[PDB]
Structure 1
Amino acid sequence: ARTVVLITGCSSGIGLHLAVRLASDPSQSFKVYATLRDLKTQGRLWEAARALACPPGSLETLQLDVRDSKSVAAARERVTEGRVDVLVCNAGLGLLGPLEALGEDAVASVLDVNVVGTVRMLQAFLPDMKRRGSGRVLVTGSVGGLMGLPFNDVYCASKFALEGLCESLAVLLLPFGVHLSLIECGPVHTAFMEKVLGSPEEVLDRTDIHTFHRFYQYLALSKQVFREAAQNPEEVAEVFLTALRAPKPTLRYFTTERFLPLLRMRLDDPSGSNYVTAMHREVFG
């Protein structure tokens, strides 16, 4: 087709869905390069695609491991049209747990994938859009990049780190015609969190009884939030899509006004003391 979109992190969730929405889109507009970290895990994208009947050629998958800077370089050359209209930054990793119980390897893959991963991504793909003076970069936000969430500290820094990188490049990209937009999402129903929790034992050995106590409390709180407010991957799909569509795009797109109030309280209290109060209260009463 004609608008060339490239998405990172597609064997499931937001990537998968964002991918097949676009490949299936009726106006047959974009050609979607669904990249997966490990190509062996692609059957789900494929059925998805068939399930919505993406016309043949509207979608190609590639292997892209955001950890691997050659892997990135590699994907790129495999893009036939010699351009990327919209480049969607989506690969992520979660990390839930008492600060002092997280593995060193794990704090480093979260920041490698979440932060270094978007960095390596944008580095490979931004240059050429700057040249053409046209280009669109979409980056999956998280409420956790705007406000701090008990027991998700490392995850929070990466989401927070992502707004640091983005609003920073946004100021420089203005005049190029390359538009950067983070897509902040609240809880999305994808099993991003299924991949996230060690077991009681781990937690147990790893931390104090008190803290061990606060974690299940959050855990039970979060679940309830989840079950009461998560959106579907297809909903969020639609949000990249609109921002994607918009002719003069803002820096942020909300997938929900859900947390809006709370994001305001923050902004309204610079000592950051009020927000802490609430969160604390809302999470542990």
Structure 2
Amino acid sequence: ARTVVLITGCSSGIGLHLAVRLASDPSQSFKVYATLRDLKTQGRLWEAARALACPPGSLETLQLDVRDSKSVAAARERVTEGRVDVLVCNAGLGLLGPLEALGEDAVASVLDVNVVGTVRMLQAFLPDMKRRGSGRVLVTGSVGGLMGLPFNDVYCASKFALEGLCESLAVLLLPFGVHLSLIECGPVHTAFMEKVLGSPEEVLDRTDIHTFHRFYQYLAHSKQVFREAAQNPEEVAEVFLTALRAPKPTLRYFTTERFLPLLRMRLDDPSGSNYVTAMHREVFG
């Protein structure tokens, strides 16, 4: 046999890299169901798989759109092993921009994919894990799920939502033998979508010039943060592996400790003033 892993959002970034990392593991201990919202995006996954010489049958792609419980259920049915040892909820959407410039549908979609989609995955796969008294659920988290980032209001809302979702589940799942962990990622080097945001023109047309100016500042700041802190997806994917291998996985794994300090500041001040002030200064100088 093998550790059956099913990962959502494997078209790019972390999910893609994790899928191939697992499938190509020298031990051949993993059987990966790299699921993708749209199978038409599986090319990079297969290119990466081949690059890592994933043995035939180590990696299988399934369509799995986490917005669709039917898709979730259909993918689950495609797990020939009849069990998922490791469920990686990585499907996600970003949403960047002045809150008032974000389309309502875009906002809804982010919550639907990031939060409800993860809920759908958990509803579909948790029961069997609880029944077996075993199973690892890894959820791609973000430091933006731990601290608010201007112009990422909805994205952060969704990532924070995952924190609440997973933490709540973790409290319950403790004695079930089902381990849920969030892999708290910082910026990761991944060239994938999200550019559906909106051109400067459309953004400026949906917000005020001051907010737009701040948005620019945030973007400039974000570029710097990525330029300085973005991790390779391989390093991040390895954190998932680490969480997977841990006999007693913690609720959270950080891919970086870079933001722990800013994070510590949030509990040091539950009023949130310290964080807000510090982050405003951090982002806007």
TM-score, length basis structure 2: 0.98
- Note the C-alpha offset of 1:194: 4.8
Alignment of 1:62-141 (within 5 A): 62-141=62-141
Matched, 1:45 2:45: yes
In 2, are the aligned partners of 1:94 and 1:195 still within 8 Å (CA)?
no
In 1, are the aligned partners of 2:32 and 2:58 still within 8 Å (CA)?
yes
Gaps spanning 5+ residues in structure 2: where? none
Q: Deviations over 1:134-185 (max 9, x none)?
A: 1100000101110000111011110010011100011110110000000000
Distance (Å, rounded) in 1 between the aligned partners of 2:54 and 2:30: 11
Change (3 A) 1:71 1:194: closer
Comparing 218-227 with 188-197, which one deviates more in the overlay? 188-197
Distance (Å, rounded) in 1 between the aligned partners of 2:195 and 2:237: 21
Change (3 A) 1:193 1:227: farther
In 2, are the aligned partners of 1:93 and 1:110 still within 8 Å (CA)?
yes
- Note the C-alpha offset of 1:205: 1.1
Comparing 261-270 with 118-127, which one deviates more in the overlay? 261-270
SS in 2 for 1:194: coil
Change (3 A) 1:182 1:75: same
In 1, are the aligned partners of 2:95 and 2:194 still within 8 Å (CA)?
no
- Note the C-alpha offset of 1:40: 1.5
Distance (Å, rounded) in 1 between the aligned partners of 2:24 and 2:48: 10
Comparing 163-172 with 183-192, which one deviates more in the overlay? 183-192
In 2, are the aligned partners of 1:182 and 1:251 still within 8 Å (CA)?
yes
- Note the C-alpha offset of 1:213: 1.1
Report runs of 4+ in structure 1 exceeding 6 Å deviation. none
In 1, are the aligned partners of 2:12 and 2:192 still within 8 Å (CA)?
no
Q: Deviations over 1:19-46 (max 9, x none)?
A: 0001001111011111111111111111
Distance (Å, rounded) in 1 between the aligned partners of 2:251 and 2:231: 21
- Note the C-alpha offset of 1:282: 1.0
- Note the C-alpha offset of 1:212: 1.3
- Note the C-alpha offset of 1:270: 1.1
In 1, are the aligned partners of 2:94 and 2:194 still within 8 Å (CA)?
no
RMSD, matched Cα: 1.0
Percent identity between the aligned chains?
100
Gaps spanning 5+ residues in structure 1: where? none
SS in 2 for 1:249: coil
Matched, 1:259 2:228: no
Change (3 A) 1:192 1:40: closer
TM-score, length basis structure 1: 0.98
- Note the C-alpha offset of 1:283: 1.1
Distance (Å, rounded) in 1 between the aligned partners of 2:241 and 2:152: 28
- Note the C-alpha offset of 1:195: 2.6
Q: Deviations over 1:195-215 (max 9, x none)?
A: 353111111111111111111
In 2, are the aligned partners of 1:93 and 1:192 still within 8 Å (CA)?
no
Change (3 A) 1:262 1:193: farther
In 1, are the aligned partners of 2:145 and 2:159 still within 8 Å (CA)?
yes
In 2, are the aligned partners of 1:94 and 1:192 still within 8 Å (CA)?
no
- Note the C-alpha offset of 1:255: 0.1
- Note the C-alpha offset of 1:193: 6.5
In 2, are the aligned partners of 1:72 and 1:120 still within 8 Å (CA)?
yes
Distance (Å, rounded) in 2 between the aligned partners of 1:201 and 1:40: 30
In 2, are the aligned partners of 1:94 and 1:196 still within 8 Å (CA)?
no
Q: Deviations over 1:98-150 (max 9, x none)?
A: 11111011001100100110000000000000000011000001011100001
In 1, are the aligned partners of 2:93 and 2:194 still within 8 Å (CA)?
no
- Note the C-alpha offset of 1:191: 2.5
Distance (Å, rounded) in 2 between the aligned partners of 1:91 and 1:211: 29
In structure 1, the partner of 2:60 is 60
